[PDB]
Amino acid sequence: PSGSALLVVKRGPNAGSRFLLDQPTTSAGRHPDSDIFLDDVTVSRRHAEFRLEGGEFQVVDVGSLNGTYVNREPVDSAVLANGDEVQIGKFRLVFLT
């Protein structure tokens, strides 16, 4: 769908899993109440957030120990583009829009 984004797990224990980005904030972490529950000791309880403000999707680190990466580069916050790879712990997710 138009305006909504997709996250596809390409590297990790749940490879092939898909998460739809259709909300203002989408939490990613090891807390079982996370929108995107990424189960691994490398992922923090509260790790990242996928934020949608206006038209652009943003990934934001919310105090994780292992950080958040966009296309192998560490970020605090980053605007995402179709085809970008987000690393949350040992998980590698592909962003599609």
Binding site: H31, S44, R46, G63, N66, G67, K90
Partner: protein
């Protein structure tokens, strides 16, 4: 004194650090030896610190040489490498240890801290949630988790295929969660455990790399270090399957053994030396093992001074010239760095590396142990020690590597790891009907292979008649035991099966009967006739292979290795051969702990064959018995197959059935010595083409000849070579009233076939079990008790005819042997 004298002293000071700096290194997290920590003052003074000296070819100050030497050999890493005989290996370590090291990135440091968070959260949960988990505590040794992680990660960085782990109980479930990656739902499914002994497989994903690597953990008994050769055999079987290493197309050895140990067991258990001795052998090498000793400087209540006679628990590794790294368990960065160096050495030189991780055991050995009763000094020191995670977090803040926000992030993560394991656990409220017979063309092909010699090969004059007699047997019959074994293995190879055969002097045979490998009289070149069956007449591979080796003079490590090899490849035909069955007791821990019981205990299956030369011949109590009675004692429904065949062909069918039944079950065979050259113990071509395995056997006069079974009044039940002697006495004394029935398969007892056979003798008034072995040995202790219970209408009144009960397998005198033997045959016909 001269500058020449001062230079000499510096060259010697440099050698003193490289050789003995490990003795001054700060490796103990507890700092228990107050007398542990000046070498510098030996003609060299404070004045010479700024004097330049030549070095390999630059010129450096004495203080610059000293700072490099101290950083490399006297900090948190004790390097032992100048005992290595290969100069290339010494230079390789010297170059990587003496270079200025670039500190880890913040990302790497945070990653190590996340693994300490996971290791400590796991331990906290274990001690809190369940009672009686003190004996398995990794507390005081959690640094082994980022260290193992760094090993596996480095193997993934080399693009290898798998890391197979062997370890004792301490920190096992922690390794399963944080290294193997098993979920908490599987780890704590029904906790009462057997979970400390089971095998497991998982996938390791690199955090900063692009590769994945398979990680597995093998099953093991409580017997410390017994699993060491088992791991090696398992890895070699995997390597052979992946066409890597010694028997592969690449020299990568892409299956890596990661062996964990305790400090008291690594020094006291002889199987450690025996397994290290396999490390570079053609038939046993795995391209080098990464060893980790979790050196908590205690063995239950015992101090290192009562457990070893050497400076370090790892000194046995000097046996094969392995480099040893002593590393302070309080420094996780040095622990991870040593782990990566170790994998790089193993890759560069295809040889073992030993990592001695010095740590402590925070608790007593088990629940209800006050460890200060036997070690008050050690535990007064331990009681004041801060945890490795909090100490590392404190170090990173101190060094300014991480911010206070980042420390809070790390503390938040830890609580999240603890909540993760507490939440998940809370929410957790057939035989193949195949023909063992082959066609006459197959028997001929195997006989022709013995004469299909390589171009310009020179056969020893005494080995040539053996080759020609095997082509004769193949086409004409009268096939002996030694040929029937090779007929069985060669025909499995032709069918595409991997056949691995090994033991002491197995290539030739202890009794000069096998000749599986033949030596070129002028060049020493080897030729393996059965290796020709790996190729079809059209030249395409069958998929089969003959892997035949002479073992080291070991039983424990050799039997363990072969058991592990059969677990590593269930499709392989794996046969270990004892010189004489009498020596297999040196491998009793493997027979007891793995072969006879692994399936019932762990669900781990093995199809290993043990060939045990057995038979009373007057050669002494150490060259007579494979202890049939002990294997029969160990047996339980579906445990093992135990046999003692009397015929070359019946042994052929036994082996072929074993390799084609589609069942994974160990096979124990009591094989012959003098019966190998017995002219009567020979078989027809038809016995190989038109028959199958016979668990019970009758005399050929009752099955082929003109023998009347109705004139029989006395029946002699036996097994082995004594049948021929009884039969010879029967022929000479022309006795129609007596018949001899052979039990070829001792376990499982063939109740139905035994019943069917005895029913063909209606006039039998007295039954007798005849054996060479003493009354308390052989098959009688079990048969005497089970035969009248299993078949009460056939064996109630079954008497015994044998040698008398003895404390040894036989008499020492061959004259006594000859007298005792004639007595049995005289009683059998008395």
């Amino acid at each position: 004194d001269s500058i020449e004298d001062k230079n000499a002293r510096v060259i010697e000071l440099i050698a003193a650090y490289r050789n003995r700096g490990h003795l001054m290194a700060d490796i103990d997290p507890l700092r228990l030896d107050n007398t542990r920590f000046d070498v510098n003052s030996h003609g060299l003074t404070l004045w010479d610190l700024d004097r330049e000296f030549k070095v390999d070819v630059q010129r450096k100050k004495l203080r610059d040489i000293l700072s490099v030497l101290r950083d490399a050999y006297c900090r948190h890493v004790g390097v032992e490498y100048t005992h290595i005989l290969e100069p290339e290996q010494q230079r390789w370590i010297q170059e990587r240890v003496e270079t200025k090291h670039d500190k880890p990135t913040v990302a790497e440091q945070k990653y190590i801290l996340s693994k300490l968070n996971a290791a400590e959260a796991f331990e906290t949960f274990l001690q809190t949630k369940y009672v009686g988990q003190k004996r398995f505590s990794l507390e005081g040794a959690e640094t082994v988790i980022p260290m193992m992680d760094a090993v596996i990660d480095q193997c993934a960085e080399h693009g290898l295929d798998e890391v197979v782990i062997a370890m004792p109980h301490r920190g096992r479930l922690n390794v399963l969660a944080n290294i193997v990656g098993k979920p908490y739902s599987q780890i704590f499914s029904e906790f009462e455990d057997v979970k400390y002994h089971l095998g497991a497989t998982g996938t390791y994903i690199q955090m900063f790399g692009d590769n994945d690597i398979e990680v597995s953990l093998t099953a093991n008994p409580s017997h410390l270090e017994a699993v060491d050769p088992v791991l090696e055999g398992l890895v070699r079987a995997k390597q052979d399957l992946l066409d890597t290493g010694e028997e592969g197309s690449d020299n990568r050895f892409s299956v890596v053994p990661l062996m964990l140990h305790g400090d008291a067991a690594f020094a006291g258990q002889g199987v450690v030396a025996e397994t290290l001795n396999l490390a570079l052998l053609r038939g046993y090498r795995t391209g080098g093992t990464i060893h980790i000793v979790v050196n908590n400087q205690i063995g239950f209540t015992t101090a290192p001074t009562d457990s070893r006679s050497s400076e370090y628990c790892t000194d046995v590794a000097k046996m094969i010239g392995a480099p040893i790294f002593h590393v302070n368990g309080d420094d996780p960065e040095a622990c991870a760095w040593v782990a990566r160096l170790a994998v790089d050495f193993r890759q560069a030189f295809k040889k073992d590396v030993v990592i001695d991780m010095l740590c402590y055991r925070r608790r007593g050995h088990n629940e209800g142990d006050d460890p200060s009763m036997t070690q008050p000094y050690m535990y007064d020191v331990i009681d004041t020690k801060r945890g490795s995670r909090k100490a590392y977090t404190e170090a990173l803040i101190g060094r300014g590597d991480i911010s206070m926000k980042e420390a809070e992030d790390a503390l938040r993560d830890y609580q999240g790891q603890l909540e993760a394991v507490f939440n998940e656990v809370r929410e957790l409220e057939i035989p193949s009907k195949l023909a063992t017979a082959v066609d006459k063309a197959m028997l001929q092909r195997i006989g022709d292979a013995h004469l299909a010699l390589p171009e310009g090969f020179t056969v020893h004059p005494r080995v040539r008649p053996v080759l020609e007699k095997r082509r004769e047997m193949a086409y004409e019959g009268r096939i002996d035991w030694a040929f029937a074994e090779l007929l069985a293995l060669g025909s499995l190879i032709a069918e595409g099966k991997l056949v691995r055969l090994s033991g002491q002097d197995t290539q030739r045979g202890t009794f000069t009967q096998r000749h599986a490998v033949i030596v070129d009289r002028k060049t020493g070149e080897e030729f393996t006739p059965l290796q020709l069956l790996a190729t079809n007449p059209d030249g395409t591979p069958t998929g089969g292979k003959f892997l035949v080796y002479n073992s080291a003079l070991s039983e424990f490590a050799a039997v363990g290795f072969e058991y592990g090899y059969s677990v590593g490849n269930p499709d392989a035909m794996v046969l270990w051969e004892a010189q004489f069955g009498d020596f297999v007791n040196g491998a009793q821990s493997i027979i007891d702990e793995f072969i006879s019981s692994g399936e019932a205990k762990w669900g781990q299956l093995s199809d290993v064959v043990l060939l045990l030369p057995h038979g009373h011949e007057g050669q002494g109590p150490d060259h007579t018995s494979g202890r049939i009675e002990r294997f029969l004692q160990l047996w339980a429904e579906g445990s093992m197959t135990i046999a003692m065949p009397s015929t070359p062909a019946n042994y052929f069918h036994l082996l072929r059935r074993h390799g084609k039944d589609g069942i994974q079950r160990p096979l124990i065979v009591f094989t012959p010595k003098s019966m190998l050259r017995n002219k009567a113990a020979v078989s027809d071509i038809r016995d190989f083409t038109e028959s199958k395995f016979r668990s019970v056997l009758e005399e050929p006069m009752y099955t082929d000849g003109e023998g009347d079974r109705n004139k029989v009044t006395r029946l002699l039940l036996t097994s082995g070579k004594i049948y021929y002697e009884l039969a010879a006495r029967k022929a000479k004394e022309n006795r129609e009233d007596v018949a001899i029935v052979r039990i070829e398969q001792l376990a499982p007892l063939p109740r139905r076939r035994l019943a069917e056979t005895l029913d063909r003798y209606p006039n039998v008034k007295e039954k007798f079990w005849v054996q060479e072995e003493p009354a308390n040995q052989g098959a009688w202790p079990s048969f005497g008790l089970t035969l009248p219970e299993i078949l009460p209408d056939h064996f109630t009144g079954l008497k015994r005819i044998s040698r008398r009960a003895m404390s040894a397998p036989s008499s020492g005198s061959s004259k006594v042997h000859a007298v005792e033997q004639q007595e049995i045959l005289d009683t059998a016909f008395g």
